[PDB]
């Protein structure tokens, strides 16, 4: 009956790649790039802002207030662009699931966060970034000892377990959440149509809020992990 782990795979460089996930990641990237070029054309400081300017201003002021509260914009200015792109890129990648792309069952487009490779690309990039930023501020060897010491030096094994748990939590929370939605839509499609639409619309409506809340959790927790890596 059901299927879940399958992908439209290809070999690109001896490495095995998914055609789905990658095209969905490309569509999310192209939508975010197009929306950013629309801002670059239409942005006004003198004249009253349009909706796309109001959107990026609301996200930028929100993520700036978080960076400024957590660590300071003078210390960590590179975290603001990263928090903004993490939010907007996850948000669009999640919200593309609202499209009616299911058919007799298969979908023309998976949400990219239903693939472990996508969430590892985001989480392991963020992990390398806050450790590299943490080293550039806490020292090459000074940083690694502060990761062990934490706030209470006797807890050093628990502090090491926290540093291992962060990239795994970022990965598997985002994956497990969007992957759950991917399983729910195929088991809802076991209903006949006269009734299928009601559980489907209930799920897709809450999956818009959940898809936005995910994007926000990943962006907030990214800013906090930068603040912990750059403290003292």
């Amino acid at each position: 009956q059901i299927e879940v782990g399958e992908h439209h795979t290809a070999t690109w460089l001896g490495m095995t790649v998914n055609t789905d996930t990658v095209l969905s990641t490309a569509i999310a990237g192209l939508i975010v790039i197009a929306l950013a070029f629309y801002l670059r054309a239409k942005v006004t400081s003198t004249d009253v802002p349009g909706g796309v300017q109001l959107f990026f201003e609301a996200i930028t002021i929100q993520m700036r207030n978080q960076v400024e509260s957590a660590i300071g914009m003078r210390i960590a200015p590179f975290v603001l662009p990263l928090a903004v792109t993490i939010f907007v890129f996850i948000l669009i990648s999640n919200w593309l699931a609202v499209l009616p792309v299911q058919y007799t069952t298969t979908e023309l487009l998976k949400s990219a966060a239903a693939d472990i490779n996508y969430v590892l690309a985001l989480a392991l990039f963020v992990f390398v970034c806050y450790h590299t930023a943490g080293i550039w501020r806490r020292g090459i060897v000074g940083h690694p000892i502060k990761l062990l010491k934490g706030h209470v030096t006797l807890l050093a094994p628990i502090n090491l377990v926290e540093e291992v748990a962060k990239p795994i939590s970022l990965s598997l929370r985002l994956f497990g959440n969007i992957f759950a939605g991917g399983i729910l839509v195929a088991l809802i499609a076991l209903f006949p149509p006269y009734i299928m639409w009601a559980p489907n619309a209930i799920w897709k409506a809450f999956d818009l809020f959940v898809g936005a809340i995910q994007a926000f959790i990943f962006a907030l927790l990214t800013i906090l992990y930068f603040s912990q890596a750059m403290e003292l």
Binding site: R173, G176, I213, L221
Partner: protein
């Protein structure tokens, strides 16, 4: 295979039972503080959001990491 398949369904059912308990109660306990804070300060709804979604993100990890491993047990069993 059939004894392993029953173990996968019972083991997977445990993972989702403990996930829903942990996260459903954890979100009720976290959201109780949001509703109480806004009740003390109506205008503080926006302020609590950040602490609230930090808390919900930590609680919901226990659900969704469990859901990843339940799905592994029932769709792609470790044995």
């Amino acid at each position: 295979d059939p004894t392993i398949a029953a173990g996968a369904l019972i083991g997977g059912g445990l993972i989702m039972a403990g996930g829903a308990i942990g996260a459903g109660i954890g979100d009720g306990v976290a959201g109780n503080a949001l509703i109480s804070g806004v009740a003390r300060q109506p205008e503080a709804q926006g302020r609590l959001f950040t602490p609230f979604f930090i808390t919900v993100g930590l609680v919901e990890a226990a659900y969704f990491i469990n859901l990843a491993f339940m799905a592994l047990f029932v769709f792609a069993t470790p044995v």
